[PDB]
């Protein structure tokens, strides 16, 4: 076996199309042990006075204006990886064009017609053209269109530019990859760093940098560093850094590095620069060339020897065979599953499914298991009913206005509460408030509390601390209550009844979130998670976010389909049980977060097989749970839109998050939906299937043809005394019949076929195309008996009338056996191709049948066919497709069709 | 003009089609003031003995087996109305070859071809003939459509009948029509009466009968008289009548009557009889018709006049000039309609959308105000938070134990408190209560008082009233209150106090409704309306609806389209203020009911055209607003699933249901929704418009033409000295432009002329036809001079060169021009065609081209035409359609399109 130089044969698609994108959180170890030239160059950026930095990246405040970003772009390059830049057309045409097999065609037509037969090794290598080109331009519209569709969403950045020719300046929203460096963007909450950055300004800016130092609490950038001098690039108080986002506040910062230049640039990029290891699809695909390679290496050195020792000239029959085995060639891979796979996702960008990369197509049709949270996907993001009360029940406007006051003046991200709390406050006491006091200090939210905080203040003698948050994390901090007006102190009974209403209101489905505030003196220092204690709990405010009427049909559906939906969400298990039986899932028994810890990794992979609803989960509980749920052959998605959903959108074989996100959210998915819903997600899981059977329809059709076709001519080839058919005119055949093929994209499946779950096996291929090989033989050798009996093709001086009678037998029935070998059900009854594949099928055989009867078959060596061949060739066309429909049946019982 | 002679000429559509159906609920005076023998009939029906009913109407216990059930059916005929039987198809052939225009060609074709010329007169009549065939398939196939989408959506009712051949008695779901006399039916909640019914049992029967003695309180049924005999047969408590529904309770009876035989069936069918006044359809139909006979008979007699004075042969020239007359046939209009109007409701039924009646259609895109119900539409079903507190705010189960009595032991129709209060009781005390109550009486919902009542009893010593409704109207009948476990008397402070909770209850938007119950000894007469005095209010259920996730973008895309929307509930004003803010709507200032009463017409009218929600209406005040809203030349469509929305459904210019709803709502309606959804209705009224227009198009298309064809025979008839073209070809050209056109209405319409409501004004053909019909005739004397002159078709003996000559210019001309005059934007680049158009059209162009190359041209008496002539007809169909491109902007201007 062996056949080590099969990897100079196989042709490996861009690396963009399929395998994911480097995502810049991974691989905490040191890459390069932080290289000395990047980690200087960073520390003397990091302290670098702002007034040379204009002068370092030739930037000025009001912006750079083209010329300048065009020069700074062509100096620097692209703000891109060096896997995401796609070859030039020429390049892919030459590309195309330089493998093994046309070269070798060519050159093998060379010398065989080299003896004066000029125009015959012409003709041969214009087939070889054509077909290059053909495939040419299937890969670059498919490309095109695929990258089209990556490039649909992608993540943005405001930056300042130049707008018109008279210098005005604005805020542009442009793709990141565009950003060139000295350029000053401006950076707001939920927005990823897209590059090194040198903050200018900032105001309360809160950053997460858990993917690249490792720590979970988010870190404070301000325009100028108020830290001694330390070593670590990372730990830079004013310097940003790729693939982390902002938790909150404001900045205005200027780009200091660009694509690679970036630090994550070298960091698995250069500084280590390893062979990445194959995805499933990849490694499938590998198979299934190598596979083909293996059978073509196997049969085509036996019909060359056969036609050498018996026929004569040894060039000829080397010519012929390789002629043959082009049939088999592992290079169409390339082309049919980008002219497959693109196809889909062009109509998955017609069901608001834009997909990034075209191997999550396979993925998404192959998921069981699919993660999600209750937010968004199963309840709505607006909540209908919501009541302020104190923890004696009655309705207190105190306990509003505080929470108006911290929604008001946080600066992270929106939420569904502060949104109601805004518009829930009349306009009247919204602006005294908002005119009577004023923000001072900000301490956002993080998992370890799960408070946010606002301290502001109505003078300058005191400042007032307003916390909000889920009801037990406020009751930890929280020691007095403002109960009927007055201060007491919070005692057990108070914690007791409280804790009993909160339960109740959680089981009517009614989220609480609790409200405290504290007064402190006046102080120059920053506000720190000490100073959350000893708070006076002002009351909670509980709200109802009912669940989308579209969520019970679209989970059937997905149930039907056989997705089963598990629910990861960090809200009380209460509240979680509540949604999961209005929406009629079920919940069965709970699991939450403070019970996995224990448990070992075998122990929570054998819970989550049987467990539907998982409350109170940490990211990190996630990120496991998604994990350990792949194990057992299951192939799981996971559904998210949060700051920290990127560990666990990349984990899970497929990720899925929607257009409107955060950035992190955004590049860490694979599918983006262009509305949160379902219904949306279970048609792109069918639409994704049917386009998955396609492809593997087509290549399993495509290469039982074509092994057929060289089964026949291995065996039939040492009893006649000359080739079977001319070379030339099995290119032909095969060039029509790809051309025929070219609708297949475009076919219809079977709902048997996608009502379940796909697997894909590569070794499936072998057993098709052994089952349906010598069926195809069999009538070949009739045929070839008819030629040689019947119509007295005797001798090698009469052979163009015997070859060009295989040929139209040869090219309609490759053509025609489509419509048999497509379905398992019985053909144009109960299951039909669609329009444009019949409609290709009998333009080709039209064009099949004339060529012979056509003036340039003198030209293709192709002599005319008497009438009285025309009703031999109807009946071996009735008698292969109605043996292969009874034998079908075989094959769906030993093996199976899916 | 006169013509009265025209009724023979225009040819209606069947009256199925258009125009809606009796619905059993009008004319309220005497229709043959109770004709003698019904009324007697009725009567001694009413007290039949039950034992010999069977015999009357050869009935048994078990049912009636299939042999008995076509012999009833035959003998009784079939439960229709005389105007619901279609008619054979061989009698729709013969009235579609019956027309005056057809025969008059056949008459004329063998006088002026009976000299011994055959085989023309016999092509002429062949010609006529596939012309007839072509009209018949089109419309056959439309009405079958347009008969079984009809046929989708129909009333049924539960029939016990036989299953299979042992004799099995099952409960078939039968359409109403399908019914026979004396056959056994059940009937249930919801359920309307189908035809004449002699009760057999029932249990608490209470139908609604207003629609026919005009009462609007609901009636018992029992299985025997209670009452003395009295003259009224629509008094009878013993038989039901088609046209009313079961308000409440179950009952078994039988068919009496059916069909025509029916109360109703004489009502307004045969006892009146008189002509209906045409809808606004068949009155803009009836004009065109007219509009294009005055055409005719104004321009063909002329070309007849001139012919015959100047040719010679008179009959010929009658034959012409019926011949060119033939293209402005006011006969196409029944298939033209009937071809596109039913192709819309096909697609129409893909999109969830089923229309009854092609009719509607029209209406359904011409909407402007669309008056509907908070419940169903704009939220959901299906509420989310319900809580049961008494007076005093804590959770009693006194009153949800109440509640589920009353919603268990009720027969009416189901409500979604019903179905909550059933799902939040928990099985235990549910299946207790259920071992421990046993229902007695139960008095209905009605609108005078808004309360339902169910009289249960634990033992046989004392009953309890329970009943339960709208919060008012249960406070007018309390007196009592059962206040911490105390029953106190109701004084004026509490009812201040729950007037002011539940008033913030509304404003949140939650619904309440409160429950009262009452002990009274046990009596064995019937418990009256009367009883419900002096109760015991045991507390209020608040309960929370949420707005459906699709209403809000729903009614955005509902407002850009025009159709302003309207809101008529009957709930509380503070509730639906707070569902259409939630939903988006504006609600401006609420009108009540109470406060429509003391309006005028003139008042009311006046304010319907600014008010959006209307809280608080009886089904009287929502049928006096949506009379009120249509005068100011609007078209209001009412979309209504209620027992009382048959006024309002038929009031309305259009009414729209829901598939799932009371029978009543689903006969007065002209719109059947699969789904209670506002995207759905959006969506169709854009496919509607789409479909209306492309009607329109299609006639204004193919009357432009053939009066252009029209007026260039007239202007160019004199001077030469023979026919411009033989009649036959322009038969041929009629024959074939109509099947070109043919695929039109699959044509594409423009968002423009589908972005507003349309108006359809028939007396814009006859301007369009005046500016389109001259720039046609342009051309064709261009024509004739180029034949004339350029190539020498100076004689007769040559004529046959002149007339093919036009012939080509006219069949392809009046093809090509499609593309030009379908739009008002530029075509090929900013509007393009459908692809069965343009398919079409290409076709006809080859099949004209190559007549004259044809052998059949010799029969058609057709020349084949020399190769120069070709280059000068490309010229002219370019110039031809570039002049009207370049013409279409003042029509434009001056006019305009839609
Ligand atoms: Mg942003
Ligand atoms: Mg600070
Ligand atoms: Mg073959
Ligand atoms: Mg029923
Ligand atoms: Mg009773
Ligand atoms: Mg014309």
Chains 1, 2 share one sequence.
């Not at 042990?33 to 960073?42: G, K, N």
Request: proline content about 5%.
């Amino acid at each position: 076996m062996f056949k080590e130089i099969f990897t100079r044969l196989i042709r490996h698609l861009p690396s963009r199309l399929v395998h994911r994108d480097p995502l810049p959180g991974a691989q905490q170890t040191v890459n390069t042990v932080v290289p000395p030239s990047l980690s200087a160059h960073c520390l003397k950026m990091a302290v670098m006075p702002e007034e040379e930095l204009w002068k370092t990246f030739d930037t000025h405040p009001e912006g750079l204006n083209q010329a300048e970003v065009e020069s700074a772009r062509e100096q620097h390059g692209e703000n891109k990886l060096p896997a995401q830049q796609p070859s030039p057309w020429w390049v892919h045409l030459w590309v195309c064009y330089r493998n093994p097999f046309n070269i070798l065609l060519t050159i093998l037509g060379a010398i065989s017609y080299a003896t004066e037969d000029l125009f015959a090794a012409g003709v041969i290598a214009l087939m070889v053209a054509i077909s290059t080109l053909l495939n040419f331009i299937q890969e670059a519209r498919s490309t095109k269109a695929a990258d089209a569709l990556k490039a649909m969403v992608s993540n943005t950045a405001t930056v300042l530019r130049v707008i018109n020719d008279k210098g005005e300046n604005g805020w542009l929203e442009i793709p990141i990859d565009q950003l060139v460096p000295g350029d000053i963007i401006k950076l707001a909450a939920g927005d990823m760093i897209p590059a090194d950055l040198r903050i200018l300004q900032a105001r309360d800016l809160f950053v997460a940098q858990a993917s690249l130092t490792g720590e979970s609490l988010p870190v404070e950038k301000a325009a100028t560093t108020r830290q001694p001098e330390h070593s670590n690039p990372l730990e830079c108080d004013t310097l940003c850094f790729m693939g982390t986002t902002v938790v909150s506040g404001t900045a205005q910062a200027m780009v200091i590095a660009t694509g690679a230049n970036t630090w994550f640039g070298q960091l698995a990029g250069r500084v280590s620069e390893q062979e990445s290891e194959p995805n499933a699809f990849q490694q499938g695909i590998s198979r299934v060339s190598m596979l083909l390679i293996r059978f073509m290496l196997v049969m085509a050195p036996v019909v060359l020897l056969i036609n050498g020792y018996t026929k004569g000239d040894w060039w000829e029959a080397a010519l012929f065979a390789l002629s043959v085995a082009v049939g088999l060639t592992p290079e169409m891979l390339p082309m049919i599953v980008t002219s497959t796979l693109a196809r889909g996702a062009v109509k998955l960008s017609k069901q608001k499914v834009i997909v990034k990369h075209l191997d999550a197509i396979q993925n998404f049709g192959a998921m069981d298991i699919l993660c999600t949270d209750k937010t968004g996907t199963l309840t709505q993001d607006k909540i209908v009913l919501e009541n302020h009360t104190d923890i004696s029940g009655k309705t207190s406007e105190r306990v509003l206005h505080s929470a108006w006051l911290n929604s008001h003046y946080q600066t992270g991200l929106k939420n569904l509460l502060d949104t109601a709390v805004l518009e829930g406050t009349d306009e009247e006491s919204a602006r005294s408030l908002a005119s009577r006091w004023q923000k001072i200090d900000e301490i956002p939210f993080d998992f370890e509390r799960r408070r946010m905080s606002v301290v502001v203040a109505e003078n300058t003698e005191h400042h007032q601390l307003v916390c909000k948050g889920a009801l037990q994390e406020i009751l930890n901090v929280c020691s007095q209550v403002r109960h009927n007006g007055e201060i007491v102190p919070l005692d057990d009974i108070m914690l007791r009844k409280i804790k009993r209403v909160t339960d109740t209101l959680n089981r009517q489905g009614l989220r609480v979130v609790a409200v405290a505030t504290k007064y402190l003196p006046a102080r120059e220092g920053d506000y720190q998670r000490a100073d959350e204690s000893d708070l006076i709990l002002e009351g909670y405010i509980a709200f109802l976010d009912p669940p989308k009427e579209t969520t019970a049909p679209a989970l059937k559906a997905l149930k039907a389909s056989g997705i089963t939906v598990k629910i990861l969400t960090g809200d009380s298990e209460l509240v979680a049980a509540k949604v999961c039986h209005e929406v009629g899932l079920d919940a069965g028994e709970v699991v939450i977060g403070s019970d996995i810890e224990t448990l070992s990794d075998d122990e929570l992979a054998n819970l989550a097989q049987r467990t539907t609803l998982f409350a109170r989960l940490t990211p990190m509980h996630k990120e496991r749970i998604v994990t350990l749920l792949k194990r057992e052959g299951h192939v799981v998605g996971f559904m998210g839109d949060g700051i920290n959903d990127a560990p666990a959108l990349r984990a899970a074989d497929i990720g899925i998050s929607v257009d409107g996100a955060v950035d992190i959210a955004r590049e860490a998915a694979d599918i983006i939906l262009l509305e949160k819903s379902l219904m949306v997600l279970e048609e792109g899981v069918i639409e994704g299937r049917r386009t998955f059977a396609n492809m593997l329809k087509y290549i399993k059709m495509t290469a039982s043809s074509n092994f057929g076709n060289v089964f026949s001519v291995l065996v039939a080839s040492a009893f006649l005394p000359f080739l079977p058919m001319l070379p030339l005119h099995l290119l032909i055949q095969n060039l029509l019949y790809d051309v025929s093929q070219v609708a297949i994209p475009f076919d219809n499946v079977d709902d048997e076929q996608i009502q379940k779950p796909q697997r894909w096996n590569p070794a499936d291929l072998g057993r098709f195309m052994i089952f349906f090989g010598p069926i195809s033989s069999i009538f070949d050798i009739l045929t070839f008996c008819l030629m040689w009996w019947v119509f007295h093709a005797n001798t090698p001086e009469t052979q163009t009338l015997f070859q060009s009678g295989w040929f139209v037998v040869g090219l309609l029935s490759q053509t025609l056996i489509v419509h048999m070998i497509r379905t398992r059900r019985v053909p144009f009854i109960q299951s039909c191709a669609s329009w444009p594949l019949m409609i290709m099928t009998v333009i080709v055989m039209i064009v099949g049948i004339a060529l012979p009867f056509s003036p340039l078959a003198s030209y293709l060596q192709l002599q005319a066919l008497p009438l009285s061949y025309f009703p031999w060739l109807v009946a071996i066309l009735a008698g292969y497709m109605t043996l292969t429909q009874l034998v079908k049946g075989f094959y769906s019982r030993r093996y199976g069709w899916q």
